[PDB]
Amino acid sequence: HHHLILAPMVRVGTLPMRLLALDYGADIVYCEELIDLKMIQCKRVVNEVLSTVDFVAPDDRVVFRTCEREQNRVVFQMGTSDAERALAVARLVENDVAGIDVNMGMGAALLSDPDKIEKILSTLVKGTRRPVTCKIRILPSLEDTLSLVKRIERTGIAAIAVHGRKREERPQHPVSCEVIKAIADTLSIPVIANGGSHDHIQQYSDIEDFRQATAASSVMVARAAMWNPSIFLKEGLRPLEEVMQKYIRYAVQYDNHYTNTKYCLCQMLREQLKSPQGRLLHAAKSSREICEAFGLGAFYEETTQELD
Numbered sequence: 001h002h003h004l005i006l007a008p009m010v011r012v013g014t015l016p017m018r019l020l021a022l023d024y025g026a027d028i029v030y031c032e033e034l035i036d037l038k039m040i041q042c043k044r045v046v047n048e049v050l051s052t053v054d055f056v057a058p059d060d061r062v063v064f065r066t067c068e069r070e071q072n073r074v075v076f077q078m079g080t081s082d083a084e085r086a087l088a089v090a091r092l093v094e095n096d097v098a099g100i101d102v103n104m105g106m107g108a109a110l111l112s113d114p115d116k117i118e119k120i121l122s123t124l125v126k127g128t129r130r131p132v133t134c135k136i137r138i139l140p141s142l143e144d145t146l147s148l149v150k151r152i153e154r155t156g157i158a159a160i161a162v163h164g165r166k167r168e169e170r171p172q173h174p175v176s177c178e179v180i181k182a183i184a185d186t187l188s189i190p191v192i193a194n195g196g197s198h199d200h201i202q203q204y205s206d207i208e209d210f211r212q213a214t215a216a217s218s219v220m221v222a223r224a225a226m227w228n229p230s231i232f233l234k235e236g237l238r239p240l241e242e243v244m245q246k247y248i249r250y251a252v253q254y255d256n257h258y259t260n261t262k263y264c265l266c267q268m269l270r271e272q273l274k275s276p277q278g279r280l281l282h283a284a285k286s287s288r289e290i291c292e293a294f295g296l297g298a299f300y301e302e303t304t305q306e307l308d
């Protein structure tokens with residue numbers, strides 16, 4: 001069995017989506033990118049009410065929320081440009097996560113500064129027992145990409161995710177499978193293929209096809225999982241209505257901010273946002289209003305009473 005990974009996605013990658021992807025067969029779940037400058041201000045809070053581990057900012061906002069169900073499968077992705085700050089964030093979350101990822105697709109800007117990438121990654125590798133990973137974008141020239149990935153490997157990281165697109169490449173531009181294959185061949189660490197949604201990934205069987213075309217260790221899915229998290233289910237895609245209700249149940253059970261639930265459902269609805277249900281969802285001013293838009297009003301009242 002080759003690993004099915006939920007790609008890190010800002011706003012999308014909150015707890016309900018990670019748990020939903022796990023239900024449908026994802027082996028590893030990356031969280032949304034969280035900026036180190038925000039994380040360093042947080043305190044670890046055990047939440048008995050929700051049975052979660054919360055990372056709470058001084059304004060009482062829960063920045064990251066995790067639970068036991070995903071403890072051995074959640075990869076924390078940080079946005080960082082400083083090694084000491086990166087390590088302090090890693091030290092905060094390491095007991096509640098299975099991996100620490102560094103965003104290098106801060107982000108794309110880091111690829112132009114390999115001394116910084118190297119400093120941050122080597123500091124993380126030496127500072128935590130958790131496997132350290134990074135997610136990169138391919139460089140304009142193959143030789144530069146190959147030198148870069150070898151230099152990153154020499155830091156001691158556990159694996160590398162490769163989005164087969166260059167910094168200036170829009171989602172409409174095709175992915176470079178041949179470049180991902182060149183990286184996988186030159187490295188002894190696992191290489192995770194990425195950048196395959198829509199153009200290559202529309203159904204489950206497409207995942208293994210993308211892995212074989214890139215000769216990679218595993219596949220990381222973003223857009224296709226965002227549109228329908230049941231993309232990870234070997235038996236085939238589940239009806240969207242069924243997936244959205246399953247999503248809302250987790251959003252309510254783990255007290256997800258209604259604007260975040262609304263955003264994730266909007267991403268799944270796509271063209272169906274013009275339907276009466278898509279309209280009810282856009283108008284929703286609370287979690288109860290999202291639930292009533294999807295026939296989960298009674299579930300909301302029952303769940304709420306138990307949590308209160």
Ligand SMILES: Cc1cc2nc3c(=O)[nH]c(=O)nc-3n(C[C@H](O)[C@H](O)[C@H](O)COP(=O)(O)O)c2cc1C
Nearest residue numbers: 007008009010032033135163195196197221222223
């Ligand atoms: C809504 C959205 C948010 C994203 N946020 C992140 C992020 O937090 N971290 C990251 O490294 N990449 C982020 N990405 C990039 C994806 O992880 C991924 O590299 C890209 O979508 C290509 O994979 P795909 O073809 O499976 O969608 C984001 C992509 C989308 C669609």
Ligand SMILES: [Cl-]
Nearest residue numbers: 104105137163
């Ligand atoms: Cl990216």
